Amino acid sequence: TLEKFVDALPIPDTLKPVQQSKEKTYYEVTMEECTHQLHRDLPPTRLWGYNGLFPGPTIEVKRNENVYVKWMNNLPSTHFLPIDHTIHEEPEVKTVVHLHGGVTPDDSDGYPEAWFSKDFEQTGPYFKREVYHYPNQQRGAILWYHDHAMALTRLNVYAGLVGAYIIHDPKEKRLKLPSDEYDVPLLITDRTINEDGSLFYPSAPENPSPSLPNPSIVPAFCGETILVNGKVWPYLEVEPRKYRFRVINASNTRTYNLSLDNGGDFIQIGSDGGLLPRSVKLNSFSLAPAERYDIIIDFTAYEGESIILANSAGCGGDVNPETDANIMQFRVTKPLAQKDESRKPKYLASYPSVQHERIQNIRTLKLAGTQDEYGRPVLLLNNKRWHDPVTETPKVGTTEIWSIINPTRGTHPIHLHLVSFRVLDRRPFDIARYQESGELSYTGPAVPPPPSEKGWKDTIQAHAGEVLRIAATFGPYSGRYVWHCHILEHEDYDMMRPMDITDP
Ligand SMILES: [Cu+2]
Ligand SMILES: [Cu+2]
Ligand SMILES: [Cu+2]
Ligand SMILES: [Cu+2]
């Protein structure tokens, strides 16, 4: 396997506007097939990148900044990863950019059927605009952007179409959180890489049934190798002081459980939807696809040390000490550029619980699915296909409780577009009884969320054999959005549903 910790961690450059005034900011981003070295000992890898970069450029905006991005497809007309056409004259390569966590008008949200081919030559049925509009009228937070094209999301994202997007709220500057050079995004992506440096993505399940098509979708993908910011098991030289890290799980399937091998602590300051009400001291944390942890690590007491960011969560088996048990390495050997004037405050933001909202609707949803003509699992939300008439139709400005029942064998990270939400509780139930009769019989009391989940979330782990309850206010915009599992192999077949936020 590839030698760990021999490449420095890339810090994606911050994207510069094409045009900017007090009234609006304008960016242009072009998807390009490019080559990049993923490790010291590998030949360059063919990848798909925003502005030809993997990851894409980091976009930094202010709260309420009127931002426009023209996302353009200049990719080849044929994919380099295996497409399974059985899961859905249309072009082979379809793309659309979704700003994950964006409080965004529906035609700028990157609807899966709002895709476009090269030069916008062909467009999906929901396509409306070339230039996307992000008003950014939302809390300061770590967002990320990635491809969302119908039935191709697992492939386009794996190809390299991911990037970070940070909203800065000037009202939070007074907290004196680590900033600028000491505010670093970490986009974590697992990959399998061939000897010749080319990306590997499976064209079928291992030793497939002859009934299965070729290529065939797989229900999950676990990469052999871990990358951070487009480099295999990198090192980051750090100064002996406080750093803020924007930790993003940009992987297809893999969930991480992160810790420091010297026994050091993380201080979590934020979740998907922004700053937590109170900072939380953690020795470890779980991070499923699309979840974000905004953390401070204090290296002040660790000068000279090499500290591994370690992973204990298995993917299709136990972690391998020499491979996927490792994420990256910090080396506390960089000379101080300046006095550490940053803070790790306890009091950060308003509790979500301050705002009282009337519960307009309680929505019960089950995670299940079926089997197709080839014998493959088809994962479904409420046993409905993507193309079935819309059923999730919250009214604009109203608050709902969603009760998500998971009788399956694994965790699903459930994501809702547009909104961030509060976690209410999790409660275990009798799976066998539910699958037989449809009746919920609880096997224990409800468990309130841990401090890490007392803030705002947009992607939430729904564990096996539990009912998860969340509360969301559906606004400020009305329109056509989506909700889905963010395991991309599940999302594409077919664990995704439209979500209509309706106006009277
Ligand atoms: Cu996403
Ligand atoms: Cu999203
Ligand atoms: Cu899933
Ligand atoms: Cu989505």
From Swiss-Prot:
Catalytic reaction list: 4 hydroquinone + O2 = 4 benzosemiquinone + 2 H2O; 2 (4Z,15Z)-bilirubin IXalpha + O2 = 2 biliverdin IXalpha + 2 H2O
Regulation: Inhibited by azide.
UniProt cofactor(s): Cu(2+)
Impact after mutating residue 495 to L: Loss of laccase activity. Mutant fails to develop the dark brown phenotype typical of the wild type strain
Effect of residue 491 to L: Almost loss of laccase activity
pH profile: Optimum pH is 7 for SGZ and bilirubin oxidation. Optimum pH is about 4 for ditaurobilirubin oxidation. Optimum pH is below 3.0 for ABTS oxidation. Optimum pH is 8.0 for UB oxidation, whereas optimum pH for DB oxidation is 5.5.
Binding locations of Cu cation 4: 412, 485, 490, 495
Plastocyanin-like domain mapped to chain residues: 44-80, 94-171, 233-311, 371-502
Temperature dependence: Highly thermostable. Optimum temperature is 45 degrees Celsius for SGZ oxidation. Optimum temperature is 75 degrees Celsius with ABTS as substrate.
Residues where Cu cation 3 binds: 148, 417, 484
One of the record's GO molecular function terms: oxidoreductase activity
EC number(s) per entry: 1.10.3.2, 1.3.3.5
Gene3D superfamilies in UniProt: Cupredoxins - blue copper proteins (2.60.40.420)
Binding site for Cu cation 2: 100, 146, 486
Mutagenesis / variant outcome for changing residue 109 to N: 33-fold decrease in catalytic efficiency with ABTS as substrate. Almost loss of activity with 2,6-DMP as substrate
One GO biological process term: sporulation resulting in formation of a cellular spore
Use in biotechnology or industry: When expressed on the surface of E.coli cells, CotA was shown to possess improved enzymatic properties, including higher thermal stability and stronger inhibitor tolerance. It has high enzymatic activity against three industrial dye types: an anthraquinone dye, Acid Blue 62, a triphenylmethane dye, Malachite Green, and an azo dye, Methyl Orange. It may help decrease the costs and simplify wastewater treatment, and therefore, surface-displayed CotA shows a great potential for industrial-scale dye decolorization.
Effect seen on changing residue 422 to K: 25-fold decrease in catalytic efficiency with ABTS as substrate. 30-fold decrease in catalytic efficiency with SGZ as substrate
Subunit structure: Monomer.
Chain's role: Multicopper oxidase that catalyzes the oxidation of a variety of substrates, including phenolic and non-phenolic compounds. Substrates include syringaldazine (SGZ), 2,6-dimethoxyphenol (2,6-DMP) and the non-phenolic compound 2,2'-azino-bis(3-ethylbenzothiazoline-6-sulfonic acid) (ABTS). Has no tyrosinase activity. Is implicated in the biosynthesis of a brownish pigment that characterizes sporulating colonies of B.subtilis, and which appears to be a melanin-like product and to confer protection against UV light.
Protein's recorded name: Laccase
Organism: Bacillus subtilis (strain 168)
